[PDB]
Amino acid sequence: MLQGLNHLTLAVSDLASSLAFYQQLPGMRLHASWDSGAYLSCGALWLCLSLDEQRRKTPPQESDYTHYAFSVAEEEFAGVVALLAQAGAEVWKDASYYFLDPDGHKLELHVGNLAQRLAACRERPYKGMVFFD
Amino acid sequence: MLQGLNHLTLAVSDLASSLAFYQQLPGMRLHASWDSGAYLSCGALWLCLSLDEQRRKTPPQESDYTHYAFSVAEEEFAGVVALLAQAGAEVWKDNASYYFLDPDGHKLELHVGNLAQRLAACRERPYKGMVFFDHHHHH
Ligand SMILES: [Mn+2]
Ligand SMILES: [Mn+2]
Ligand code: NI
Ligand code: NI
């Protein structure tokens, strides 16, 4: 039986460039690096960077909505966003902040879990929404 | 401070096709669905499906190595892979890991072991040019 996400692996074109970008994020931690990848963690998240020359840096309008979001407390959301604004991180769309990584992977800062989102969705459902017990 | 992965959102071309696929995985559980998306959980993972016009069934050779792996216990790895083999899930890379695609071509994986165990394995035998940053006394 599946117990959860084991690891998230992102294909990167320049490992040193990607390592600088993720090391600036508070909570991100570098455990090891080698010639074609690196191992990082962020809380329980095991993040793996994999060097891939068949990885393009893609502008956000030319990729789909697949994105990866990281948890930030409400009291610290404003701080982290200011840190990425000062760093010059490019935003790709409009309690969330959407920013890309050096290769164009769509990332997000988000406050709230799945339980708070379903509760909000109960009080105001989307079109055709069904809840399952 | 970033505390961890908040949610993983996958773009899908057929929402109903995708929910059949992910619900076939034991432990994958559906909480809500609507016209253009769904909310699922798997342990602590919050998985979100988002219906997208601009999404192709991408062949594995035409996409990069970005993939998403799910944890399975050692005693149950064979069962879950056998379940996906009988279901006909397309494999995207040879072989404690099993690499399979979802109906849109998102690269997935089942894996036994965590990052602490992989780091231990890597220190017994490192990759090319590997440098470790958690202090150890392995020789
Ligand atoms: Mn999101
Ligand atoms: Mn993997
Ligand atoms: Ni040894
Ligand atoms: Ni020591």
DSSP secondary structure string for all residues of B55-105: -----GGGS-S-EEEEEE-GGGHHHHHHHHHHHTPPEEE---EEEEE-TT-
CATH number at residue B133: 3.10.180.10
**Separation of CA B137 and ligand 4 centre (Å):** 6
Record the resolution, in angstroms.
2.7
Residue B76's SS3 state is: helix
Q: Using the beta-carbon criterion (under 8 Å), do A26 and B80 form an inter-chain contact? A: no
Residue B98 structure tokens: 């099993």
Q: How far apart are CA A39 and CA B132, in angstroms?
A: 10
Taking residue B131's Cβ as centre, other Cβ atoms within 10 Å add up to 11
Reduce the secondary structure of A19-85 to three states and give it as a string: HHHHHCCCCEEEEEECCCEEEEEECCEEEEEEECCCCCCCCHHHCCCCEEEEEECHHHHHHHHHHHH
**Separation of CA B110 and ligand 2 centre (Å):** 8
Residue B114 structure tokens: 């965590």
Is B138 within any annotated ligand binding site?
Answer: no
Secondary element (H or E) of residue B19: helix B15-23
Method: X-ray
Strands of the sheet with B131-132, listed across from one edge: B91-93, B97-101, B107-111, B67-72, A2-12, A45-51, A37-42, A28-33, B131-132
DSSP state of B35: T
Residue B68 structure tokens: 């998403």
β-bridge partners, A96: A110
Encode burial over B16-43: b for 16+ CB neighbours within 10 A, e otherwise.
eebbebbeebebbbbbbbbeebbbbbbb
Residue span of the structural domain in which A123 resides: 1-133
Which of B 72-111 lie inside 8 A of A, CB atoms? 72-73, 76, 80, 106, 109-111
Q: How many domains does chain A have?
A: 1
Q: How far apart are CA B108 and CA B81, in angstroms?
A: 12
Taking residue A59's Cβ as centre, other Cβ atoms within 10 Å add up to 11
Whether residue B49 contacts residue B10, with contact meaning beta carbons closer than 8 Å, is answered with yes
Amino acid at A44: A
Q: Cα-atom radius of gyration of chain A, to the nearest Å?
A: 16
Residue B28's SS3 state is: coil
Whether residue A49 contacts residue A10, with contact meaning beta carbons closer than 8 Å, is answered with yes
Closest approach of A65 to chain B, Cα-based (Å) = 5
Q: Which ligand ends up closest to the CA of B124?
A: 3
Which residue is associated with the tokens 């989307």? A126
Whether residue A54 contacts residue B107, with contact meaning beta carbons closer than 8 Å, is answered with no
DSSP state of A133: -
